[PDB]
Amino acid sequence: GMSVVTSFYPMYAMTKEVSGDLNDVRMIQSGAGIHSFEPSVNDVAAIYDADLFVYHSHTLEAWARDLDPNLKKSKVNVFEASKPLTLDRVKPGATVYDPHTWTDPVLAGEEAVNIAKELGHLDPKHKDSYTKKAKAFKKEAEQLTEEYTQKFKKVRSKTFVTQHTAFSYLAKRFGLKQLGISGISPEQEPSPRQLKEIQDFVKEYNVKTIFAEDNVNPKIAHAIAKSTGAKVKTLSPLEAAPSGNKTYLENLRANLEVLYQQLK
Ligand SMILES: [Zn+2]
């Protein structure tokens, strides 16, 4: 079987679709707050009793690097799936990086390819089945990429505002510009200064939709929206496990579809 643990939805969906039915994948945190998530002794115990723990990046789940198998006498394989990927710093001249690479199809696709290389490396008797499921996912990912890259070039509106800075990589890939009401994390709420900057930014680029998210309180988003004449819609950074039973990419497609509609 091989027990695979996973940090949050994105990691869960990529490792699962790539694993198929071969293993038993579980998710540590399915709720919200991955940014401020901190494991319980039950959680780490779970990680250690696992054969494989998959997480996104130390820049997000910093707690993960604190995990030490050799010491705890565990046979677990801690794997940081975005390690090969290169993160943009949050601000020009800043020691911190933006971890929201999964909302960008291409990076998501290649993160899933790295995850499959791990599964294959830890379970050689199925190495073929893994890379086979990864190519499919990545191919779809490119398919999804080619699609929206066309839809967006046919939209003259390019800017949108989101609840928190979680779509920089998605925007960057489709030639769109974004600004987050909050920072890399939803807890990093705006001072009265930034609010007015968000406002003047909305006015500057005639942004007509402020995208809130199910994870946080839309008060501030509604506020800005009422003061700048823009309306509020919901856009998911996929940090929380989506309702329904769509594929990861299907879930992503649905989100950049609303993006395309609001922007046109
Ligand atoms: Zn985030």
The experimental method is X-ray
Tell me how far apart the alpha carbons of residues 120 and 89 are, in angstroms, rounded to a whole number.
31
Query: Which token pair is 216?
Result: 């946080």
Q: Where are the beta strands (DSSP E) in the chain?
A: 3-8, 24-29, 52-55, 77-80, 159-164, 177-182, 209-212, 231-234
Listed residue (61, 48, 67) closest to 5, CA to CA: 48
Query: Which token pair is 18?
Result: 């790539």
- The string of DSSP codes covering 135-156 is HHHHHHHHHHHHHHHHHHHT-S
Tell me how far apart the alpha carbons of residues 215 and 103 are, in angstroms, rounded to a whole number.
16
Distance 240 CA to ligand 1 centre (A): 10
Distance 103 CA to ligand 1 centre (A): 10
**Could you list the residue range(s) of the whole structural domain that residue 114 is in?**
1-155
3 state SS of 168 = helix
Tell me how far apart the alpha carbons of residues 10 and 24 are, in angstroms, rounded to a whole number.
16
CB 84 within 8 A of CB 112: no
Chain breaks in the chain (C to N over 2.5 A) after: none
Look-up of token digits 């899933």: 112
Q: Is 222 annotated as a binding residue?
A: no
Query: Which token pair is 80?
Result: 């940081």
Query: Do 132 and 252 belong to one domain?
Result: no
In the chain, the number of structural domains is 2
Query: Which token pair is 132?
Result: 């086979």
- Strand 52-55 versus strand 24-29 pairing type: unpaired
Query: Which token pair is 204?
Result: 């500057």
Query: Do 112 and 201 belong to one domain?
Result: no
Residues with Cβ within 8 Å of 112's Cβ and at least 6 positions away in sequence, in order, are 14, 15, 17, 18, 134, 137, 138, 141
Q: Which CATH number characterizes residue 214's domain?
A: 3.40.50.1980
CB atoms within 10 A of CB 89: 11
Query: Do 122 and 175 belong to one domain?
Result: no
Distance 35 CA to ligand 1 centre (A): 6
Query: Do 120 and 4 belong to one domain?
Result: yes
Query: Do 51 and 151 belong to one domain?
Result: yes
Distance 201 CA to ligand 1 centre (A): 21
Q: Name the domain boundary from 120, 155, 190.
A: 155
Query: Do 117 and 243 belong to one domain?
Result: no
Query: Do 143 and 242 belong to one domain?
Result: no
Distance 43 CA to ligand 1 centre (A): 21
Query: Do 63 and 134 belong to one domain?
Result: yes
Q: Is 239 annotated as a binding residue?
A: yes
Tell me how far apart the alpha carbons of residues 72 and 49 are, in angstroms, rounded to a whole number.
10
CB 166 within 8 A of CB 237: yes
Listed residue (22, 24, 28, 23) closest to 9, CA to CA: 28
- Strand 209-212 versus strand 177-182 pairing type: unpaired
Tell me how far apart the alpha carbons of residues 98 and 252 are, in angstroms, rounded to a whole number.
19
Tell me how far apart the alpha carbons of residues 229 and 242 are, in angstroms, rounded to a whole number.
29
Residues with Cβ within 8 Å of 199's Cβ and at least 6 positions away in sequence, in order, are 224, 227, 228
Query: Do 22 and 122 belong to one domain?
Result: yes
Q: Name the domain boundary from 155, 186, 207.
A: 155
| Burial of 190 (C-beta count, 10 Å sphere; 0-12/13-18/19+) | middle
Which 8-state DSSP code applies to residue 236? -
Q: Please, what is the angle between helix 248-262 and helix 105-122, to 10°?
A: 170
Residues with Cβ within 8 Å of 134's Cβ and at least 6 positions away in sequence, in order, are 18, 112, 113, 115, 116, 117
Query: Do 31 and 105 belong to one domain?
Result: yes
CB 133 within 8 A of CB 18: yes
CB 1 within 8 A of CB 20: no
Question: Rounded to the nearest 5°, which phi and psi values hold at 231?
Answer: -100, 165
Tell me how far apart the alpha carbons of residues 246 and 251 are, in angstroms, rounded to a whole number.
6
Query: Do 252 and 241 belong to one domain?
Result: yes
Look-up of token digits 């004449």: 229
Q: Name the domain boundary from 124, 155, 186.
A: 155
Q: H helices of the chain, where?
A: 9-19, 41-49, 69-72, 105-122, 127-153, 168-173, 192-204, 219-227, 248-262
Tell me how far apart the alpha carbons of residues 50 and 59 are, in angstroms, rounded to a whole number.
23
Query: Do 142 and 32 belong to one domain?
Result: yes
Q: Is 118 annotated as a binding residue?
A: no
